[PDB]
Amino acid sequence: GASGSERLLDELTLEGVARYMQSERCRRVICLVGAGISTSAGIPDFRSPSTPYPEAIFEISYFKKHPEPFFALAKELYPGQFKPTICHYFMRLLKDKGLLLRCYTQNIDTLERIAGLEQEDLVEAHGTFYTSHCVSASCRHEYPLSWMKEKIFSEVTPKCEDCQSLVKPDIVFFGESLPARFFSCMQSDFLKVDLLLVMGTSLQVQPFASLISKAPLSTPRLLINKEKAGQSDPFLGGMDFDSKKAYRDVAWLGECDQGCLALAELLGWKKELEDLVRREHASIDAQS
Ligand SMILES: Cc1cc(C)nc(SCC(=O)Nc2cccc(COc3ccc(NC(=O)c4cnn(C)c4)cc3)c2)n1
Ligand SMILES: [Zn+2]
């Protein structure tokens, strides 16, 4: 139930969440993540202001007629390295510890995959650059990022080797529907969730934001983010961190890496997390 029933967290703190996680009551964790988990990897959030008309470049109709701007922007914004963050590897540890039901991400940077989350573990709600497809319905040839990268840097508009149609990265352009996978997984996963870990997202983009309202009433929800988010708008379920009726929502305010480190430390996972990150970062740095 809600605040009227007995609550699962013994206290509304990171410490309470950790105790819950290590109890038999918590078996399945869903992560909801956004751009805030990749900024420390040097991938800016293109929605953060500090980073025909401007919006055309992300519209599917404009792209199909004039793809060159998008692909020029893609070359300019292409990360110099793909090194997932502590937050990404914390989710890998959740997987290793048998706690990860699913990671729903709004990011297109592939860092979840690089950090060791597999397709089954992931719902890329806004799509991804990881794969691309020929846009012709009768073809739909798939291309890997290695192929798309070469086209982007060579400044050659990517065309299908089979039919010469445009090849589009599998991101959800505006005007496109979210992937069917998002809706199908959401319908199943939120019947099964014991904990919702919301990291590095302001929960301002829909329908991704509405996911928090899909959790059972009793399911604790931990937000690790620079700012509080997910509360109902006094003008326009929602997060309740602070009222007298608060019973399950916890906000840890700071950088995602530091929050995940703090949680891992409480869990006795800090050495495991350090060892994993340092090994994988070393491996990525040594790519030859
Ligand atoms: C080029 C490249 C390759 C790889 C692997 N990673 C990167 S990361 C840096 C970056 O930002 N690179 C970058 C390069 C070119 C273009 C963009 C813009 O990306 C997106 C991604 C998703 C959306 N769609 C929604 O938000 C949405 C739709 N419907 N709804 C409801 C919501 C829109 C734009 C990013 N960049
Ligand atoms: Zn084709």
Swiss-Prot record:
Q: What is the effect of changing Q106A?
A: Reduces deacetylase activity. Inhibits the block of entry to chromosome condensation and subsequent hyperploidy cell formation in response to mitotic stress
**What does the annotation give as the result of altering F183A?**
Strongly reduces binding for the peptide inhibitor S2iL5
Tell me where it mainly resides.
nucleus
Identify a single GO molecular function assigned to this protein: histone H4K16 deacetylase activity, NAD-dependent
Cellular component GO terms held in the UniProt record = centriole; centrosome; chromatin silencing complex; chromosome; chromosome, telomeric region; cytoplasm; cytosol; glial cell projection
Pinpoint the Deacetylase sirtuin-type domain residues.
7-270
Q: How is it modified after translation?
A: Phosphorylated at phosphoserine and phosphothreonine. Acetylated by EP300; acetylation leads both to the decreased of SIRT2-mediated alpha-tubulin deacetylase activity and SIRT2-mediated down-regulation of TP53 transcriptional activity.
Keyword Amino-acid biosynthesis in the entry? The reply is no
Carrying Phosphoserine, the residues are S50, S146
Residues involved in Zn(2+) binding: C134, C139, C160, C163
Q: Per its UniProt entry, what is the enzyme's top EC class, as one word?
A: transferase
Q: Where in the cell is it found?
A: Nucleus; Cytoplasm, Perinuclear region; Cytoplasm; Cytoplasm, Cytoskeleton
Describe activity control: Inhibited by Sirtinol, A3 and M15 small molecules. Inhibited by nicotinamide. Inhibited by a macrocyclic peptide inhibitor S2iL5. Inhibited by EP300-induced acetylation.
Q: What is the effect of changing R47A?
A: No effect on deacetylase activity
The residues responsible for catalysis, as annotated, are H126 (proton acceptor)
* Record text on subunit structure and interactions: Interacts with CDC20, FOXO3 and FZR1. Associates with microtubules in primary cortical mature neurons. Homotrimer. Isoform 1 and isoform 2 interact (via both phosphorylated, unphosphorylated, active or inactive forms) with HDAC6; the interaction is necessary for the complex to interact with alpha-tubulin, suggesting that these proteins belong to a large complex that deacetylates the cytoskeleton. Interacts with FOXO1; the interaction is disrupted upon serum-starvation or oxidative stress, leading to increased level of acetylated FOXO1 and induction of autophagy.
Biological role: NAD-dependent protein deacetylase, which deacetylates internal lysines on histone and alpha-tubulin as well as many other proteins such as key transcription factors. Participates in the modulation of multiple and diverse biological processes such as cell cycle control, genomic integrity, microtubule dynamics, cell differentiation, metabolic networks, and autophagy. Plays a major role in the control of cell cycle progression and genomic stability.
Supply the name of the protein: NAD-dependent protein deacetylase sirtuin-2
Could you tell me which species this protein originates from?
A: Homo sapiens
